Assembly symmetry: D2
Homo-oligomer: 453 residues x 4
């Protein structure tokens, strides 16, 4: 027992490293995925709902707002104040109901202007709490994806592309099963990663972010009891697609079913898996000495600690993404509430991802070629030239090729190759090209593929 | 120690229930995902490669084949014989190399016709083993997806759609947190599942199945050493997209990187997750007595054992899909061989999925309505009508609504509602509609949504 | 784009709900698992190492400390000041090395007293950073397990035991496959959970928490170069087992290999899995109306939201525990650094666990029996008495039992049973006991088992 | 569409590679975990139950059996015939109930001897199907663990121990973060793995395998209705602990709750995780050329394909173990049947494990030292000797050590070290030892630790 007094929350004392050691890397998510962010977006959705009712000619009891009333509401929806989130937390100490606390805050703000007080009972009109929550979650995911996550993903792809093109012509021994194999270029091996990452970026950006607004159980019961002549399905689709810029989900229960969150998180996890592969392969190239790493003055160790930090955080991110994708879309009957607490972690997998992306970018920026080590391994591996000799022998039908090639590989050297080539019953132009071969020259079209990535 | 003599393999003695208790449900996968299937497709790809070289004007050493030579090759590629797979296994006892054994089998078959013997050294010309493997895996996945998996997925969606439409008008108490909530219809709750499943079917069917053919390390080194003037990238894309009907992957190492396998398995897993949710919710409806189940003469128990079997097998399927998606796309440098053994399990997650799909279809086919139990719970829940009364009161600005509504809910009954409605300062047409309300009538537009699924 | 200004960290703006919405439930972990906690324990281990060297007669250059020198060091190790952790973070901005920053802080504190300044180069003597880290992690896990986690686990077991005993005699219909089955008592069904939880508590408490202190790569190289005559293995075991109260790991690389962290987290996850099962089953009993829940004045809904919050957080906890157990014990060669960032999340799975445990305790405290609903289902299920009638018929060899029992079940009622029993060729004492049977009486020895849990 | 005719089951056509490509490695599991094995053990448990009743003085209606009756029953329980499992499958085509089919088979065998026919209604007396299933599962797991899995685990530990001792004195450069670090010995790095594996072997062997026998819902209801004076709890514990050699679980529902299966599978997974780490590290040593691999005559490639196969199969095994541990112990109320189909896969994770263990043993047996490559890297790394020089300088208080040591490392060589050591204000005996240092000599006590593993 090493007991300790209570400590106030700071980045030093935060239990999770998302808000702790890595707070500086995750702070852009605080307006989005925190409880403040959830409250902010709940208030936005409530305000826009009330404004939609005011504009709706089928809802005469909410008349179109004056500029002054709109200005108050627009300030809540687009210039949200921390003091209101603090008040909502205070109200929640009584209600033990977080969306009801948002409602009460909005009624308190509406009370201050008579035009808004007169329609205060239309705040949240016919809504269930999940009508507000699901639209908040989609807006949070849209903001986190588009303004924080995707820019960093594209930064990684472009930083690796720059190196792929720079290093396109640098021949390098390949390793399969860890053992020497036909050469490539270092730029080609980096280009391969760019191509994979960009496929997943396109998939991440393409996921439709679904929303609904349809009352307690999905069927607009309360809406139709009060306003049987209003087309509430048309209103909902216009609100969600037009007013909010999301994609409409026409069939739900109390909750939006969360399949699109699984789709999005599965796509981010696939990007992260490619980046784990990259972090490990580059750790391996640095272990071989093929890359060296720039140092920063005053720092104390060069070890690839940024790639290692990235790899560790991508694993955590993907574990969380896998859990949320597997668990969120199962909900008992017209819903159970186990998803609410889980959805408070939408930002946590994204946080571990962007921590890793910043770390991978830092590691990439330190990479410098060590051409001497790359060339050392290549020039010590004339054995890679058995394959092209064998393939040319096959083209031209050289007799007893297995025995014949074994005369060379019992082994290969520049001089032994020159001698062996002249023994072969192949045309003169075939000999000219084989005699030019060196390990570093036997790269196929790696460089051309790399340059056009 | 209960020791036992050695047992030959049969469905009774198979260790895995895929080939054991459930062999009858998985037998359509035997020509596809088994070692026989892998061998079958390897032979197909080798044959089509040789035929592509024969047709290629840039490869004059392989002349276009006679009809008789094509007939032999076409028989290997489209009427494959188990005896050849058995011979390949025999050869492999020497080579300890499965694709090399395919090569040797093809050379043995080519030896039988002089036209083919003359080009036997062009079997597998310039290929690495993974050129054959990755195209085999894509063709296997295409066949399993299109001819076995997707038809069963669509059968489930259509069987649930039929019930959704049949039961569209059947009012039912909703349960949120397990507790009574505003009514729906049983058909609407089934329609919700159809909509989710069909989104994932579209995603499953839409995954592009990627292939490559580019030699040892991705760069066509051997091809270009023998045939420097042939456009091998164009040839590869035409082979893969045109001859084989797959999608070209232009950047790979020795292996195709397997991201599209993660994409496909992530999409099947999302379908399976919806079907787990359905299996559990229907188990719950059967527990409530809302559905009864038909019985089969002579069987001994009615318990929802087909839904339970389905739910158990979907969990196994998804565990395997998650592992393969997470692990396959990480491979050391220009590849490690840990993916080979894992890819022998491509069919196993699919097998557990189709076992579950058959079980869910069997359970669905047994479902029959128990309207008495559904109505019993609804008519015992007049409390659901507080919400519409409250919403109408809000529309018309009824004073002190919290206190006023509490006069009714201290509770609600047909008679107490009639009396309470007449107390309200609301228009006559609002009273007419509230006075018609019954729990079973308070379903919103559930039925119309359900009918158009 | 709903852009937002930068926000300082508070529980409202924290991205993770561990330090956000649930900060009040996790604050006891801040002195333990946060970066502050890691720093605190690193300083403790360094101080105790230096004190061990001072006491070691084989290290004459560090003489036993004066009381005044011990007092300074003891204050660092047992009354740690946030200002020192803040200074360490400042130093780390230069070093980019967190344990080196601890070293420099300790050298700054040692400079203030000449007796300590004279041995400042023995701070961290012969250590590698992981000698300090691994002992810190074990001490952190010990404190979190023993002082925070295990007390809450035992609170749950005892709270369920109290209800099991209270409800031991309350007969209840069982449900298997969701369908009626032979009765039990509600207390017996709760007792079953206590027994399972306490097995896992014993396993959690029993995990040995392993430590090492052996230099850069596990072999005491530096120690032996300077002090070849000191038994450094004996010193390490005495330090770890005696001075620190941990268990010695005699074989490591640079890192302690983390298997015991997998053992501990696997055991906590098994407890959590039982508690998920409990949270779901109780949600089901509340859905059946068998339990009602107390309400709190002023709160706004009764729904089992505490059990649902618990269930959601146990799933997150277990996802993190599974990842850390699977990934931490794999480390490249004599180590890679991917474990460091992952180990900053040791407290996060524990945090989600204790959030869930508090929520489950809150839900349990609200539970009250609804005996009317339990009895309603039982008295409507005379069909459960076919089984005992059939078993008695088997004991006494009643002829044609299948046909005979079918005469009764075509069904069972109190009166039909009285009549049927008199038809049976069984002894008088067998009839006496069958005639007493009622559904609520047919509970076996459930009550006696429940009372002794 | 490459359609194909139906294929009968063989190892070539099996969908799962457990019964397919790897059938030869898994065939020892066929009498244990297959449907045959499940049936075999169900028959064993039923027979032993009937024999327990015959011996029970409180069950006078089943008299102690003649030797002839025991011989028939003992043959069913200890010399089980495939023909009976085939008959059970035939009966199951009618019953659609697998344990009821076992009952009917046993009644058919009992009919053949009048002494057994007279007690045929005591076959399965008062049991529920899960009384037979759970005891079967525990006996299956015991047999698979003790007779197949643990022997292979110990074979791996001993094979690595043999190499650890053989290579105990072989100095080797360490790599941390992939970069050079203080030397070790190759035998020490292998010894570290032995120690970890054997901890998990002890845990695997120590798991108690739990059983119950207590009727439909855990409360002996039917037993007590027929035999109210028999102590059925004492009988159950004696049957399970004494007759069957298992451990008693006193609190269950219809099912044994499966926590001990999670405990066992978690322990096997921890062993497998260590073996993945080993497979990867050895793949790395082979990539460095530190080990070479023996070849087999006629085989065609040396690549570490056995370690790669092992690593791939351990990942699959652990994915299945994780799923079964997480899912099996959650069961709705007094049970749902989703566990039945999942438990048919108890042998599948074990199968992938023993495939991997055989592959790792094959790879280990091929390992041979390449002392030239190990020594090449060591003798090229005099930089490892900065650490001991620095530590000796600290012991003796050498002034301005940072600047002083930098005079040497701007670098280190045998000659520069000799010169630098003579500059230091340290005692003569300290210089004698520093002057002896070479990279290969700077291994600490690695060799002594390795030799006593
Ligand atoms: N049906 C519901 N829909 C939305 N929110 C709800 C519902 N029922 C309760 N809540 C509130 O949702 C919040 C859940 O908190 P948590 O479990 O911490 O995510 C609490 O404020 C609950 O009172
Ligand atoms: N680089 C390679 N590409 C493709 N197959 C290979 C390679 N190296 C070895 N193999 C063969 O792939 C098979 C792998 O078997 P398995 O590990 O059981 O999936 C064996 O027949 C190996 O000899
Ligand atoms: N071999 C090592 N052992 C322990 N810590 C190290 C090692 N190398 C670097 N570090 C430091 O460990 C910390 C890792 O930070 P993080 O990746 O955020 O957990 C940084 O301060 C690194 O400089
Ligand atoms: N309550 C029960 N306990 C044990 N087995 C059962 C139960 N109810 C049904 N079964 C049988 O268990 C088997 C389950 O098959 P599967 O789902 O393929 O594992 C079928 O033969 C069912 O009829």
């Amino acid at each position: 027992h090493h007991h300790h007094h209570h400590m106030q929350l700071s980045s030093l004392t935060a239990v999770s490293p998302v808000d702790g050691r890595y707070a500086g890397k995750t702070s852009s998510l605080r307006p989005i995925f925190s409880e403040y962010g959830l409250i902010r977006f709940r208030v936005m959705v409530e305000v826009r709902w009330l404004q939609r009712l005011a504009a709706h000619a089928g809802i005469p009891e909410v008349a179109p707002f004056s500029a002054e009333a709109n200005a108050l509401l627009d300030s809540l929806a687009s210039d949200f104040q921390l003091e209101h989130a603090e008040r909502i937390k205070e109200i929640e100490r009584t209600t033990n109901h977080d969306v009801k606390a948002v409602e009460y805050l909005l009624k308190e703000q509406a009370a201050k202007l008579p035009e808004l007080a007169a329609v205060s009972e239309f705040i949240h009109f016919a809504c269930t709490s999940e009508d507000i929550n699901n639209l908040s979650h989609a807006l949070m995911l849209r903001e986190g994806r588009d303004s924080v996550l995707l820019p960093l993903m594209r930064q990684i792809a472009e930083a690796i592309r720059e190196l792929a093109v720079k290093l396109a012509d640098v021949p390098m021994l390949s390793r399969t099963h860890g053992q020497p194999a036909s050469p490539t270029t270092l730029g080609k091996e980096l280009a391969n990663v760019v191509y994979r990452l960009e496929r997943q970026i396109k998939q991440v950006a393409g996921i439709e972010l679904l929303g609904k607004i349809n009352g307690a159980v999905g069927n607009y019961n309360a809406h139709l009891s009060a306003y049987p002549e209003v087309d509430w399905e048309a209103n909902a689709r216009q609100f969600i697609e037009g007013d909010l810029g999301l994609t409409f989900n026409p069939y739900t229960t109390q909750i939006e079913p969360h399949d699109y969150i699984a789709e999005l998180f599965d796509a981010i996890a696939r990007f992260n898996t490619i980046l784990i592969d990259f972090d490990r392969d580059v750790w391996g190239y640095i272990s071989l000495g093929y890359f060296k790493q720039k140092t920063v003055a005053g720092e104390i160790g060069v070890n690839p600690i940024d790639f290692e930090n990235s790899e560790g955080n991508l694993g955590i991110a993907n574990a969380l993404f896998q859990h949320l994708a597997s668990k969120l879309p199962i909900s008992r009957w017209q819903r159970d509430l186990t998803d609410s607490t889980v959805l408070r972690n939408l930002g946590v997998g994204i946080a571990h991802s962007i921590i890793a992306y910043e770390a991978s970018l830092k590691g990439i920026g330190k990479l410098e070629l060590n051409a001497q080590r790359i060339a050392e391994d290549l020039d010590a591996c004339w054995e890679v030239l058995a394959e092209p000799v064998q393939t040319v022998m096959r083209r031209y039908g050289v007799e007893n090729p297995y025995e014949k090639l074994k005369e060379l590989t019992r082994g290969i050297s520049a001089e032994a190759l020159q001698t062996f080539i002249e023994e072969l019953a192949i045309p003169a132009e075939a000999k000219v090209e084989l005699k030019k071969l060196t390990p570093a020259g036997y790269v196929g079209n790696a460089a051309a593929q790399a340059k056009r990535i």
